């Protein structure tokens, strides 16, 4: 919706890619969290990545997070096969809900 | 770090309601959130509320907040830190704009800045 | 299906009683990690 | 609020944590056939007392309710993160998972202290 | 001067407030009919010291004789001036005028004592 | 190395300096007929540990193992070089040539406290 992210990049092996999620001051950034999820096409989701740069239990460290006053960023770095699908990220603070973003699609064919 | 098997694919059509249900277990059921996303051919995810299986309160989205009926059960405790517990979600004005996999998830912490954060999903039931 | 009384194991009937009880050792001291270190 | 003596039994660690005065106050005072009994309760519950209090005499804690040390981590005895720990589990739930390393840690907590008074006997010694 | 035990009970607060390890020594040691009433004595002395003990540890005045805290002094316990206490009343005369507030001030100096090292615990988490 | 309890009985002083957390565990757990024996016991074993407890107290070393003072070494006492005790002697020695005046350095360690809290009164008056 207005949390507008990065529409879609391809990547290769070994490489790092980077997964933009900005949208207007009415959601992002310096006063709101970002969440990022691996989304399989309309299965099983995954939490990545809480409170800006902080990783979830048994996530990779490859994953990475970054906010800025204007656009939030979630790095892959090294990729592994297994790393094509749908990326999104979502706004929200303590007391609120999820913004979700427009979803990302990253290629990794090498 | 347990399971929340969901219900099946209950096909209607637009005007009716639909109740999906939400069994958990391997973890209490009454000390995380139990939020509900769906994922809709037409646009991405839409985030449309959490409830506190505890405090019983309910906070969900503008969007959804006169349409969806949010309940929950009450945990059978299996051990000490572990439960079985039950959450439903129906949705009022159905059409076939509210066409997707619906997914119930149990917050992340029980504490914090990111307490009722969709942590462990279910697997998703296929609506109209 | 029939049944008799009895009894005579007098701790059945404490057991009536003390059912809604148990006894618990507390242990206070408890080790945790967090970025504190003390200082030289 | 005034949960009352074990009152965050149910509550996170980090909530828990603020509330150890509670439980420091009732255990060595309280929330002829046992006469003797009597007395041989009064006697272990000291016991009980100067053992926990050895421990924290040993580990420079002597007085303190939190109390920072020296002993680093072990990624060996939990593997969980920060903000897991003390916004999520319950110190009931805590001292069952570090269960086992529980006896590894008190010997650490001990000559880590040896040492440091060791070092300060040498830093004031000019 | 040394008065002794309790020499000071009759004197000001400020002079009684120098001799104070004398009544601190003779509080664990001193200045078959009873063998289970003299055992029934060693037990009773060690347990009002380890409640003594017990309040000092929970207030940050462990090992402590003089121990100043951050409890301001309430003018409604005695609005007495400073040189009208230590330089006029007697140890005995001013715990009865503090007897009713007494329970009030020992609460105080623990929540001021759990707060003062969860903000330590804060100070050293950098 | 790990000698154990009392292990360094036979080295010298600088050595055993370092091995106390050793003999520190050991001084309060361990290494009808006896029932009001073994009670015996188990009352004896807190009253001596509080007393040695009870002396560290008000010398201020309370939860110290090694201790720094104010006293001065009189030479009267044992007129013999540092490098000559701790390299030299071994803690039973010592004690039996410090037997007599054993008594006095414990009275001094005790003003020299009260004295030193009464003067942070004072620095902290203002
Ligand atoms: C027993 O176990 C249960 C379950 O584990 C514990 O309940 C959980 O407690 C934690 C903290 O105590 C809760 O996290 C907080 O969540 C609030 C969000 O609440 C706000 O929004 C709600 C929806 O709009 C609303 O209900 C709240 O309004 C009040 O009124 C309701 C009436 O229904 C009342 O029940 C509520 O309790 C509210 O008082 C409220 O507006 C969130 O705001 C908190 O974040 C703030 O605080 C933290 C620090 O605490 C800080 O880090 C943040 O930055 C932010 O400042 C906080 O995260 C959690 O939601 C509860 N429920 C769960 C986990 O399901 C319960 O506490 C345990 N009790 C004991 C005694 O052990
Ligand atoms: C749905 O929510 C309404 C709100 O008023 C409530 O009355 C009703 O009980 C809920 N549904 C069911 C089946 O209970
Ligand atoms: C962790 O503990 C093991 C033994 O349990 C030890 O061999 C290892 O060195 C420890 N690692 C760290 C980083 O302390
Ligand atoms: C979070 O905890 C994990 C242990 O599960 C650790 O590997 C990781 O480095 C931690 N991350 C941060 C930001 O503390
Ligand atoms: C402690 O040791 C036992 C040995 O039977 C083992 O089963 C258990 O998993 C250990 N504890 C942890 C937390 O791993
Ligand atoms: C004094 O004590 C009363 C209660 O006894 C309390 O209400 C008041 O706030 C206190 N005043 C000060 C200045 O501490
Ligand atoms: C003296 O004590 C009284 C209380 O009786 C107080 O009101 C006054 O301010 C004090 N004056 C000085 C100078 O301390
Ligand atoms: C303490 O309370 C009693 C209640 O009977 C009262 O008479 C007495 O005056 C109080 N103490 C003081 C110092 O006022
Ligand atoms: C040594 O002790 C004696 C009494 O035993 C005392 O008179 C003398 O002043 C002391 N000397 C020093 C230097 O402390
Ligand atoms: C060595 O000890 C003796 C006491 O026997 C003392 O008189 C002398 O000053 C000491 N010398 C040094 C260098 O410490
Ligand atoms: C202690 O006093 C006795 C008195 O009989 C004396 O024989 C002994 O030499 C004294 N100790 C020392 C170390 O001089």
């Known amino acids: 919706s207005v949390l507008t992210q990065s529409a879609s990049v391809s990547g290769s092996l070994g490489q790092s890619v980077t997964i933009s999620c900005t949208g207007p001051n009415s959601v992002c950034c310096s006063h709101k969290s970002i969440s990022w999820y691996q989304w399989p096409p309309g299965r099983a989701p995954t939490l990545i990545i809480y409170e800006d740069n902080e990783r979830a239990p048994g996530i990779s460290p490859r994953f990475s997070g970054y906010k800025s006053y204007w656009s939030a960023y979630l790095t892959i770095s090294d990729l592994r096969p297994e790393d094509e699908t749908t990326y999104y990220c979502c706004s929200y603070t303590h007391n609120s809900g999820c913004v979700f973003g427009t979803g990302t699609k990253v290629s990794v064919l090498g | 770090q347990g399971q929340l098997v969901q219900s099946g694919a209950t096909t209607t059509k637009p005007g009716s309601s639909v109740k999906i249900s939400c069994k958990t277990s391997?973890?209490?059921?009454?000390?995380?959130?139990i939020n509900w996303i769906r994922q809709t051919a037409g646009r991405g995810p839409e985030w449309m509320g959490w409830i506190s299986p505890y405090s019983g309160d309910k906070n969900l989205a503008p969007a959804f907040q006169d349409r969806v009926n949010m309940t929950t059960d009450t945990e059978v405790p299996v051990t000490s830190f572990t439960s079985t517990g039950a959450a439903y979600m129906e949705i009022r004005n159905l059409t076939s704009d509210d066409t997707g996999t619906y997914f119930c998830a149990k917050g992340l912490l029980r504490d914090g800045s990111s307490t009722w954060l969709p942590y462990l999903w279910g697997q998703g039931t296929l609506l109209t | 299906e029939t049944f008799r009384p009895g009894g005579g194991d007098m701790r059945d009937n404490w057991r009536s009683e003390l059912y809604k009880y148990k006894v618990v050792k507390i242990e206070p001291l408890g080790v945790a990690p967090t970025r504190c270190k003390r200082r030289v | 609020v005034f949960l009352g003596f074990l009152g965050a039994a149910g509550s996170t660690m980090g909530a828990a944590s603020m509330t150890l005065t509670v439980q420091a106050r009732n255990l060595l005072s309280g929330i002829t056939v046992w006469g003797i009994k009597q007395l041989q309760a009064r006697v272990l519950a000291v016991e009980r007392y100067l053992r926990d209090q050895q421990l924290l005499g040993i580990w420079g804690c002597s007085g303190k309710l939190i109390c920072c040390t020296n002993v680093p981590w072990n990624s060996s005895w939990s593997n969980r993160n920060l903000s897991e720990i003390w916004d999520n589990m319950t110190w009931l739930q805590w001292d069952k998972e570090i269960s086992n390393y529980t006896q590894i840690i008190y010997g650490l907590l001990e000559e880590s202290q040896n040492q440091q008074e060791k070092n300060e006997q040498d830093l004031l010694a000019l | 001067v040394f008065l002794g035990f309790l020499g000071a009970a009759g004197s000001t607060m400020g002079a009684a407030s120098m001799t104070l390890t004398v009544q601190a020594r003779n509080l664990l040691s001193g200045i078959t009919v009873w063998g289970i009433k003299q055992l029934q004595a060693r037990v009773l002395a060690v347990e009002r010291y380890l409640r003594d003990q017990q309040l000092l540890g929970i207030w940050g005045c462990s090992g402590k004789l003089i121990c100043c805290t951050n409890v301001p002094w309430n003018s409604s316990w005695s609005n007495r001036n400073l040189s009208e206490i230590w330089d006029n009343m007697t140890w005995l005369q001013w715990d009865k005028e503090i007897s009713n507030y007494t329970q009030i001030i020992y609460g105080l100096l623990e929540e001021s004592q759990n707060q003062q090292e969860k903000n330590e615990q804060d100070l050293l988490a950098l | 190395v790990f000698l154990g309890f009392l292990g360094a009985a036979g080295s010298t002083m600088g050595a055993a300096s370092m091995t106390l957390t050793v003999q520190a565990r050991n001084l309060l757990s361990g290494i009808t007929v006896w029932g009001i024996k073994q009670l015996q016991a188990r009352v004896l074993a807190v009253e001596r540990y509080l007393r040695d407890q009870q002396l560290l107290g008000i010398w201020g070393c309370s939860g110290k193992l090694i201790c720094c003072t104010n006293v001065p070494w009189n030479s009267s006492w044992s007129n013999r070089n540092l490098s000559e005790i701790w390299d030299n002697m071994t803690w039973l020695q010592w004690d039996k040539e410090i037997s007599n005046y054993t008594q006095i350095i414990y009275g001094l360690l005790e003003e020299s406290q009260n004295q030193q809290e009464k003067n942070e009164q004072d620095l902290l008056a203002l």
């Open positions: 391997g973890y209490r059921f009454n000390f995380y959130h």
